[PDB]
Amino acid sequence: LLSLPLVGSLPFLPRHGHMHNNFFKLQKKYGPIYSVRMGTKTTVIVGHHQLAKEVLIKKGKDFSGRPQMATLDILSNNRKGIAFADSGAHWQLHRRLAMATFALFKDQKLEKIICQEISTLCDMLATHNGQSIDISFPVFVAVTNVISLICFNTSYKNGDPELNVIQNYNEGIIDNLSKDSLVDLVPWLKIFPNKTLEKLKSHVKIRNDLLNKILENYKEKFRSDSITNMLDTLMQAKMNSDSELLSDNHILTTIGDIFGAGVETTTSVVKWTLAFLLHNPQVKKKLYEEIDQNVGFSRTPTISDRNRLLLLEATIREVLRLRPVAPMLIPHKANVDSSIGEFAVDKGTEVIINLWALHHNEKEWHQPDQFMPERFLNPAGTQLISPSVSYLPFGAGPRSCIGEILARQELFLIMAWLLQRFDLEVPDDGQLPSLEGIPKVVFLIDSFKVKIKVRQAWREAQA
Ligand code: HEM
Ligand SMILES: CC(=O)[C@@]1(O)CC[C@H]2[C@@H]3CC=C4C[C@@H](O)CC[C@]4(C)[C@H]3CC[C@@]21C
């Protein structure tokens, strides 16, 4: 009796369980690195930090490419911009300029911009005293203005419906960009009839039309004696072309990525820490104690307070470990014939870092499935530590995040201002938010409500 012919084999079931975790599970069988082939494309998944730091750092330039995806093409306006552009003159140029712009708010100091919008955020939420609300949108508004000031030196006022329009096409872009992660085993979208690409083009069209109208209005405003924002930095470079790479679409797409990344990432991480704090009241209680002691109510928190508020800075680290924004980063591509752990990797191969596997490695983390911000503190709780090298929430090397400083500062200040001023409790109904998560291009959390009430200690300190 003979064996059946085999036309295809996948090591696990599609769309059953999270991809990043199904891949992780395979390591028990095949080791920390292995490959899968879909027609001609070969994809390599790396799930150990040593191999990962070879791919991202030690051989950064070799693997600095991006694979091409049909969905990403629409969003990146055919591989322009930064995040989804292939390695090349255009990618490198815009990344540099973008990084350069952040210099223009170094001691309109970035810390002062952020706290400005947080103050407005906290006054809004104070009116909701005693009510249970979703805080998604108010935070969305806060960070949107920050990124807008950096890009245009403009900010939207409360109730500007352009804010709701932006919220609408961002949710639509994220929803259709990918069912789960950007890492699909099976290219379902080229197989069955679907409106996926149609829908995406419509959300993206609206977004693009909105970014063109800001550009056309700003060409009148642009003056070379003033370089104060990202859009100035980019138009200046165009005019110093005595050029193909600084076309209107190249600039537009780049702003697109920055606007997108600066909002959806930080909002999602803010929602994640609160979710974790409702589930872990002991940690939250100690956070109140901490901030009461080292900051009090004489003033509002500042970047200098990271030195004193260690349990908070540690909490944020633990959330980025447990629920990374990109649990498989963005996929990488081999620009040349190269190797990994002395295994051959041909040019054009897709390389995916399983960051989830790095952050949940039993041999690198104690009880890695548990929320324990303490793990990033010494036993005394007197200074921060780095208990594992297997930790890359922001990536590493040529393709590493470029908003990490901004990112880290926003999260710290938002969480500090809120804890100073607000009791944040479970709503009158007994539900807690599910921590299971939703894997999109971003690792999202199901929307949930939190009862917000102004702190008694905040009121009294006004008398
Ligand atoms: C908690 C917040 C954030 C996290 C965890 C995060 C994480 C990451 C990761 C993992 C990558 C790429 C990984 C890789 O491909 O190796 C990335 C890329 C990138 N991020 Fe962030 N990010 C955050 C916030 C931001 C912010 C605030 C900005 C503001 C501009 C930003 C802009 C970008 C850009 C433009 C890239 C792509 C750069 C390139 O491909 O060369 N991100 N981020
Ligand atoms: C976390 C991360 O890798 C990123 O920050 C890099 C590029 C970000 C990307 C940039 C642009 C957009 C368009 C926006 O309307 C939706 C969010 C999205 C997809 C950002 C998601 C986070 C990305 C991938």
d(CA 54, CA 59): 6
Q: Can you give the residue range of the structural domain that contains 30?
A: 1-463
Q: Which residue has the tokens 């030690």?
A: 58
Residue 123's nearest CA partner among 142, 143, 140 is 142
Task: Provide the β-strand partners of residue 423.
Answer: 453
Ligand 1 midpoint to CA 333 (Å): 17
268 lines ligand 2 (CB under 6 A): no
Ligand 1 midpoint to CA 104 (Å): 19
Elucidated via:
X-ray
Query: Measured in whole angstroms, how far is the alpha carbon of residue 341 from the centre of its chain?
Result: 29
The best mutation among 401, 405, 411 to test binding of ligand 1, ranked by most ligand atoms within 8 Å of the C-beta, falls on 401
Instruction: Give the number of the ligand closest to the Cα of residue 444.
Output: 2
Return the ∠ at Cα 234 (arms to 233 and 235), rounded to 5°: 100
Task: Provide the β-strand partners of residue 444.
Answer: 438
Give the nearest ligand 2 atom to 174 CA: 16
d(CA 320, CA 430): 27
d(CA 287, CA 307): 14
Report yes or no: 251 and 238 within 8 Å, Cβ to Cβ: yes
Give the nearest ligand 1 atom to 406 CA: 27
**274 φ, ψ to 5°?**
-55, -45
Nearest residue (CA) to ligand 1, atom 19? 401
420 lines ligand 2 (CB under 6 A): no
User: 285: which 2 tokens?
Assistant: 């209680």
User: 18: which 2 tokens?
Assistant: 């999270």
* HEC letters along the chain: CCCCCCCCCCCCCCCCCCHHHHHHHHHHHHCCEEEEEECCEEEEEECCHHHHHHHHHHCCCCCCECCCCHHHHHHCCCCCCCCCCCCCHHHHHHHHHHHHHHHHHCCCCHHHHHHHHHHHHHHHHHHCCCEEECCHHHHHHHHHHHHHHHHHCCCCCCCCHHHHHHHHHHHHHHHHHCCCCCCCCCCHHHCCCCCHHHHHHHHHHHHHHHHHHHHHHHHHHCCCCCCCCHHHHHHHHHHCCCCHHHCHHHHHHHHHHHHHHHHHHHHHHHHHHHHHHHHCHHHHHHHHHHHHHHCCCCCCCCHHHHHCCHHHHHHHHHHHHHCCCCCCCCCEECCCCEEECCEEECCCCEEEECHHHHHCCCCCCCCCCCCCHHHHECCCCCCECCCCCCCCCCCCHHHCCCCHHHHHHHHHHHHHHHHHHEEEECCCCCCCCCCCCEECCCEECCCCCEEEEECHHHHHCCC
Ramachandran class of 153: left when φ > 0, alpha when ψ lies in -120 to 50, beta otherwise: left
Tally the domains of the chain: 1
Report yes or no: 36 and 45 within 8 Å, Cβ to Cβ: yes
Count of Cβ atoms closer than 10 Å to residue 118 Cβ: 22
174 lines ligand 2 (CB under 6 A): yes
Residue partners of 112: CB distance under 8 A and separation at least 6: none
Ligand 1 midpoint to CA 330 (Å): 9
403, amino acid identity: G
Question: Binding site for heme: which residues?
Answer: 401
What CATH number is associated with residue 231?
1.10.630.10
Nearest residue (CA) to ligand 2, atom 4? 261
The pocket around ligand 1, CB under 6 angstroms, is made up of: 82-83, 95, 257-258, 261-262, 265-266, 269, 320, 325-326, 329-330, 393-395, 399-403, 406-407
User: 298: which 2 tokens?
Assistant: 């004489």
Instruction: Give the number of the ligand closest to the Cα of residue 266.
Output: 1
